[PDB]
Amino acid sequence: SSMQRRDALNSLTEYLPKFKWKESKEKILDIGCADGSVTNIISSCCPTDFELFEACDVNVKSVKYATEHYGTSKMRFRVMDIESDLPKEMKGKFDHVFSFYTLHWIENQEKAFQNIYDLTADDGECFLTLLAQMPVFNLFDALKHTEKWRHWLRYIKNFISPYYETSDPDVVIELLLKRVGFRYVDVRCRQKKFEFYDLKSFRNLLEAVSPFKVGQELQEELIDDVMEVAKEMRIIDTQNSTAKLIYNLVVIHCRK
Amino acid sequence: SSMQRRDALNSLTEYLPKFKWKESKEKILDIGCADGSVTNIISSCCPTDFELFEACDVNVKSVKYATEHYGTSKMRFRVMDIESDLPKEMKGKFDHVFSFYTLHWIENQEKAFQNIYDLTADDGECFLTLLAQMPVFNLFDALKHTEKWRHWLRYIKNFISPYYETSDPDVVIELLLKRVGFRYVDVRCRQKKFEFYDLKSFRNLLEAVSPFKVGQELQEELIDDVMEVAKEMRIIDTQNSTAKLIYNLVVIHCRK
Numbered sequence: 335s336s337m338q339r340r341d342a343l344n345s346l347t348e349y350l351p352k353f354k355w356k357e358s359k360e361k362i363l364d365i366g367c368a369d370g371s372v373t374n375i376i377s378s379c380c381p382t383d384f385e386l387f388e389a390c391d392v393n394v395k396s397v398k399y400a401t402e403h404y405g406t407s408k409m410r411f412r413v414m415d416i417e418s419d420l421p422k423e424m425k426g427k428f429d430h431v432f433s434f435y436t437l438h439w440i441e442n443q444e445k446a447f448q449n450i451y452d453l454t455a456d457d458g459e460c461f462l463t464l465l466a467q468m469p470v471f472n473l474f475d476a477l478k479h480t481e482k483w484r485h486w487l488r489y490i491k492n493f494i495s496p497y498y499e500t501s502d503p504d505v506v507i508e509l510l511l512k513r514v515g516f517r518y519v520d521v522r523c524r525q526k527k528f529e530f531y532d533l534k535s536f537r538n539l540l541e542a543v544s545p546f547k548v549g550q551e552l553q554e555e556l557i558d559d560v561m562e563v564a565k566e567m568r569i570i571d572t573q574n575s576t577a578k579l580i581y582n583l584v585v586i587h588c589r590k
Numbered sequence: 591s592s593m594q595r596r597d598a599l600n601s602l603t604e605y606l607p608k609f610k611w612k613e614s615k616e617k618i619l620d621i622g623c624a625d626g627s628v629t630n631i632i633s634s635c636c637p638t639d640f641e642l643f644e645a646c647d648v649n650v651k652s653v654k655y656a657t658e659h660y661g662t663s664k665m666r667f668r669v670m671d672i673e674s675d676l677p678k679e680m681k682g683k684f685d686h687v688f689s690f691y692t693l694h695w696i697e698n699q700e701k702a703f704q705n706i707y708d709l710t711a712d713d714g715e716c717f718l719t720l721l722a723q724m725p726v727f728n729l730f731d732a733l734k735h736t737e738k739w740r741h742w743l744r745y746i747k748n749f750i751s752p753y754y755e756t757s758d759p760d761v762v763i764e765l766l767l768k769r770v771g772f773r774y775v776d777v778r779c780r781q782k783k784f785e786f787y788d789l790k791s792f793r794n795l796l797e798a799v800s801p802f803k804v805g806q807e808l809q810e811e812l813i814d815d816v817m818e819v820a821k822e823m824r825i826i827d828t829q830n831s832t833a834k835l836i837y838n839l840v841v842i843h844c845r846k
């Protein structure tokens with residue numbers, strides 16, 4: 335979506351100058367590729383001569399879309415889970431590891447970051463963006479607690495960032511990257527604003543990211559109520575008919 | 591209040607090890623001293639032998655309270671405005687300048703920071719905490735836009751952080767500290783959670799920080815409605831009868 339695009343571009347444009355680029359043909363990995371659109375933006379950034387670029391995700395519908403639309407000779411689109419053990423093949427395989435807007439889904443944080451360290455080759459670089467505090471999380475968790483929906487979304491799986499309510503999350507993550515054994519580590523917490531100029535654009539997002547898969551005949555009525563609690567929470571401005579999201583995106587830049 | 595205390599203590603405990611301490615008797619300044627309670631915490635942190643420690647604020651009721659309760663031989667409590675020109679006396683006077691939770695009031699940001707640089711002595715250190723994104727701001731601005739209060743709080747002065755809606759505010763401030771001419775500058779944006787276990791404690795805060803001075807007979811009814819929009823905004827949890835604030839505090843550590 336627009337937010338991920340804007341944040342991916344802005345995150346790169348800033349940190350690209352700070353990267354070490356090995357002279358020899360490179361081995362790169364992006365984690366959570368989804369559409370492949372954003373990982374295509376990443377591939378386009380410097381090294382024209384690299385051996386292989388790999389891009390993995392959990393969604394199977396997406397990896398196929400992304401392999402058929404963006405997949406090439408040196409752009410392999412695999413299915414993999416970071417919350418899971420690696421094959422012996424991939425330990426120390428990759429020179430540069432990327433992952434944007436993906437690591438706030440992992441139940442077991444340390445396992446995923448421990449993997450990331452093991453994938454990164456000797457004298458390699460990481461670059462991962464990650465959501466902490468985000469209103470959308472509070473907006474949906476608010477609906478799950480509504481008198482109407484309380485009972486029929488009591489046991490629903492609602493995936494919220496592990497860091498959406500943690501103090502100094504930059505420090506928490508920094509220490510977890512030093513335990514796992516990264517030599518250099520830079521974790522900054524970036525406050526971001528994103529605006530919606532009509533409600534149909536905001537609605538379009540809510541529909542997309544909603545963590546509540548339900549009957550398509552309820553899907554419409556559910557977001558009707560979500561758009562309503564968004565008015566109550568002042569995520570949308572009723573008078574101007576606009577929406578505004580201020581959220582924290584932690585960006586991580588580390589070497590081993 | 592509890593938040594400022596907790597954040598002041600936590601900010602110090604972390605950054606004190608990173609400070610250079612001149613061997614010769616020191617000249618220290620805290621800006622926005624208010625009660626004097628917090629600036630007393632600051633004075634207590636290392637140097638037992640300093641020449642003079644000065645602590646200024648705009649509130650006259652407070653400077654008197656703070657001078658009579660906390661004021662000593664080497665603890666002078668002056669009235670001063672940073673949004674205003676300094677006397678020739680104070681340019682390059684102070685070895686260490688502090689200011690917590692104070693610089694998000696200044697209409698003219700660059701003037702205030704330009705002052706700060708001029709007060710700091712040659713080869714000196716700054717340490718300033720500063721609010722960016724804070725729900726309380728959104729909570730009161732929400733009330734000011736209520737159908738009931740819209741008209742009679744149309745022209746009311748509502749002091750919200752200049753950075754409560756800015757992207758990468760750490761970068762904005764960092765660049766404004768390099769323009770003004772600080773040699774070393776470290777600006778981090780720290781996400782913080784603070785919890786309230788009863789509503790009376792949350793109410794007690796709202797009453798205190800409310801930017802709407804009005805008849806004492808309305809003051810009660812106003813916060814009654816603020817506590818209500820706080821339920822609508824999910825700042826307070828209705829079922830548990832608790833309140834929770836997640837906010838960004840930018841902490842600045844610079845030398846000239």
Ligand SMILES: Nc1ncnc2c1ncn2[C@@H]1O[C@H](CSCC[C@H](N)C(=O)O)[C@@H](O)[C@H]1O
Pocket residue numbers: 335338342365366367368372390391392393396414415416417433434435436439440
């Ligand atoms: N454990 C896991 N390992 C890898 N990918 C995962 C994962 N859990 C979720 N994902 C996937 O990670 C993706 C995050 S969405 C963002 C993808 C991409 N970084 C971008 O900038 O758009 C989703 O496709 C999600 O399904």
Ligand SMILES: Nc1ncnc2c1ncn2[C@@H]1O[C@H](CSCC[C@H](N)C(=O)O)[C@@H](O)[C@H]1O
Pocket residue numbers: 591594598621622623624628646647648649652670671672673689690691692695696
């Ligand atoms: N332009 C200005 N210059 C100096 N102090 C100012 C100011 N505008 C507001 N203040 C004062 O700055 C104080 C900020 S409140 C926090 C004070 C102290 N740093 C603490 O940690 O508690 C208030 O007393 C406010 O009245």
